[PDB]
Amino acid sequence: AMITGGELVVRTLIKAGVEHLFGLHGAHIDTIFQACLDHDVPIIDTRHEAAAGHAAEGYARAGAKLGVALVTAGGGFTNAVTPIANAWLDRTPVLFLTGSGALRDDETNTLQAGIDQVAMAAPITKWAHRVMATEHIPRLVMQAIRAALSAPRGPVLLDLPWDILMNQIDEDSVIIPDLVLSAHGARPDPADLDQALALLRKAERPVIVLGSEASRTARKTALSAFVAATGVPVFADYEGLSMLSGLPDAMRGGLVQNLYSFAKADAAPDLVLMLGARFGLNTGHGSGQLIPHSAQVIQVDPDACELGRLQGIALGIVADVGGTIEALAQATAQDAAWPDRGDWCAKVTDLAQERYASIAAKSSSEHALHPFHASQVIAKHVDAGVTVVADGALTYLWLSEVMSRVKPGGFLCHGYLGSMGVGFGTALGAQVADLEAGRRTILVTGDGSVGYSIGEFDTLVRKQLPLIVIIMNNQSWGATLHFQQLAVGPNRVTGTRLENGSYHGVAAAFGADGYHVDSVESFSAALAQALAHNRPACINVAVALDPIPPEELI
């Protein structure tokens, strides 16, 4: 009945409800591997701690739950920092467990010791802390979990010294707490809710914009009730998109980028209800290009700093986005009637169709496969049964154009960090989450980005994870090459070409199914075949580089 600190870690994780970890082995953290082995808790071990970190993010994002990453001292930790930073800006709930030097061997210039891992993580975590006593493990693990899961969600680092984990203590001398933290988020004051609803009622052209916090709490039933009662069209940033999948067509505004053309059509929203969507990269900053300067804005966010960050707002509410959605659905259920918004919804629909049609008209695959056409081939397969993860740059910009009319089970794109290459790990973790949900994961990445984590084909094969990796291959770091041509000059391309390498050949050498395609017909065939089998796959798609996606042209 003596147990290790690592055993305490795992017992606390199990009690919290954790069922998977992502990681890479080291002696420093072996006690956690041994405890997981004993308790039949899978640790999905990758070929790089970065991929493990991103997998924990992908698992969290796809499954709307806590992701758990597990890395060893020193380079284990430093290899996980891009995931930490990505989860930080994305508001993704990930518990990063890292080993560190033994406290008893402090300042001995020893193996993997001497990196101030807590200091390195401090700027990019909700909380980061080094455990000082084995007996503290359960309470501090649970504290870390509460930090990560609470609004706004985000990453936490718990640093566990080798001696602290190896230490044995009497199991009856320490209690393993429950996770006692309400599942229901805090909601607005009724006066604020009444004011928001009065504004929503009076608007001529109201819209809702969902952000990541909407996705984390995933109150889709309540969202549907609210949206059905009010008839208000709903848009979302990338992270919020999959929250629109259960909504009636007339109310699906799609990606918030679609608001761009509304002003020119004399149709700019006069009221915007932002639910966890920040003023920033995905919402046009303070430009007024998507969220009009002439609109009254009601913003709901758990972080007061965000409220009107870049633009004057009418009503700033600090509350949980999920809780607020519940409250709005509760309020509008008591309502006899809401203004008819058929005409406005139709306008929203028509404007989306006009964008899509315009792109379709301009796109030609006469000489090489057009990125828009390649994106459409994927779109035909996207529904509730699929999670789409997007990496690259031009690649996701083109892909985004087909994403609003489909209803993905999940959609995981770059956030503010825009870190090329994070998608592979992200998609691998998403696929683990998706297994329980009966979903198939498709990664859509660029030829540049896939190189970051290309070893993970080995992991797919060892773990029999049926991730489909589609590489949009334009023989370049594409968006950066576009930048050079457009911002500097046509003869100023340097350091951005990638005219080498058979990626499907690399996949095949790792035991995954490899395909190379270069047309709508060949791509359609390959994708259909890949989807028909429960096997990991790489589809290398030769695509044109020259086309400029609308988001880039903007």
Ligand X SMILES: Cc1ncc(C[n+]2csc(CCOP(=O)(O)OP(=O)(O)O)c2C)c(N)n1
Interacting residues with a copy of itself between 173 and 212 (CB under 8 A): 175, 177-178, 180-182, 184-189, 191-192
**Residue 269: which residues within 8 A CB-CB, separation 6 or more?**
203, 205, 206, 207, 259, 262, 291, 292, 295
Q: Of these, 2, 132, 333, 357, which contacts a copy of itself (CB under 8 A)?
A: 132
Q: Does 515 bind a copy of itself (CB under 8 A)?
A: no
Within 10 angstroms of residue 361's Cβ, the number of other Cβ atoms is 8
- 147-152-158 Cα angle (round to 5): 30
Q: Residue ranges for the binding site for thiamine diphosphate? A: 25, 49, 393-395, 418, 420, 447-449, 452, 474, 478-479
Binding mask 382-421 toward a copy of itself (x if CB under 8 A, else -) reads: ----------------------------------xxxxxx
Residue 129 annotated in active site: no
User: Cβ of residue 509: shortest distance to a copy of itself, in angstroms?
Assistant: 3
- Out of 20, 28, 48, 381, the active site residue is 28
342 strand-pairing partners: none
Give the whole-angstrom CA distance, residue 75 versus residue 24: 11
- Out of 7, 20, 48, 49, the active site residue is 49
Q: Which does 532 bind (CB under 5 to 8 A by kind): a copy of itself, ligand X, none?
A: none
Strands 156-161 and 127-130: parallel
Within 10 angstroms of residue 103's Cβ, the number of other Cβ atoms is 15
Give the whole-angstrom CA distance, residue 286 versus residue 275: 17
User: Cβ of residue 418: shortest distance to ligand X, in angstroms?
Assistant: 5
403 strand-pairing partners: none
What is the enclosing helix (H) or strand (E) of 228? helix 220-230
Which residue, 377 or 513, is less far from a copy of itself as judged by CB? Answer: 513
Q: Which does 474 bind (CB under 5 to 8 A by kind): a copy of itself, ligand X, none?
A: ligand X
- 352-199-262 Cα angle (round to 5): 20
Give the whole-angstrom CA distance, residue 166 versus residue 214: 40
Q: Does 315 bind a copy of itself (CB under 8 A)?
A: yes
In which residue are the tokens 């998977």 written? 20
User: Cβ of residue 143: shortest distance to a copy of itself, in angstroms?
Assistant: 5
Residues that bind ligand X (CB under 6 A): 24-26, 49, 72, 75-76, 79, 392-395, 418-421, 446-449, 472, 474, 476-480
Rg (CA), the chain: 24
Stretch binding a copy of itself (CB under 8 A), from 59-67, 343-351, 424-432, 478-486: 478-486
Q: Residue ranges for the binding site for Mg(2+)? A: 447, 474, 476
Q: Which does 86 bind (CB under 5 to 8 A by kind): a copy of itself, ligand X, none?
A: a copy of itself
Q: Does 246 bind a copy of itself (CB under 8 A)?
A: no
Q: Does 452 bind a copy of itself (CB under 8 A)?
A: yes
**Amino acid present at 170:** D
Write the burial class of residue 395 (CB in 10 Å: 0-12 exposed, 13-18 middle, 19+ buried): buried
Q: Does 165 bind a copy of itself (CB under 8 A)?
A: no
* Nearest Cα residue to 414 out of 429, 400, 435: 400
**Residue 186, token pair as written in the block:** 């805090």
Q: Which does 19 bind (CB under 5 to 8 A by kind): ligand X, a copy of itself, none?
A: none
Q: Of these, 3, 10, 16, 43, which contacts a copy of itself (CB under 8 A)?
A: 43
Write the burial class of residue 460 (CB in 10 Å: 0-12 exposed, 13-18 middle, 19+ buried): buried
Write out 358-421 in H/E/C secondary structure: HHHHHCCCCCCCCHHHHHHHHHCCCCCCEEEEECCCHHHHHHHHHHCCCCCCEEECCCCCCCCC
Q: Of these, 69, 87, 141, 147, which contacts a copy of itself (CB under 8 A)?
A: 147
User: Cβ of residue 416: shortest distance to ligand X, in angstroms?
Assistant: 11
* Nearest Cα residue to 329 out of 232, 447, 252: 232
User: Cβ of residue 68: shortest distance to a copy of itself, in angstroms?
Assistant: 14
Q: Which does 446 bind (CB under 5 to 8 A by kind): ligand X, a copy of itself, none?
A: ligand X
User: Cβ of residue 340: shortest distance to a copy of itself, in angstroms?
Assistant: 30
Q: Which does 395 bind (CB under 5 to 8 A by kind): ligand X, a copy of itself, none?
A: ligand X
Interacting residues with a copy of itself between 253 and 312 (CB under 8 A): 278-281, 285-286, 303-305, 307-310, 312
Q: Of these, 37, 333, 357, 360, which contacts a copy of itself (CB under 8 A)?
A: 37
Q: Which does 511 bind (CB under 5 to 8 A by kind): a copy of itself, ligand X, none?
A: a copy of itself
Residue 381 annotated in active site: no
Contact 457, 512 (CB under 8 A): yes
Q: Of these, 172, 342, 438, 500, which contacts a copy of itself (CB under 8 A)?
A: 500
* Nearest Cα residue to 453 out of 186, 57, 66: 57
Which residue numbers are catalytic?
28, 49
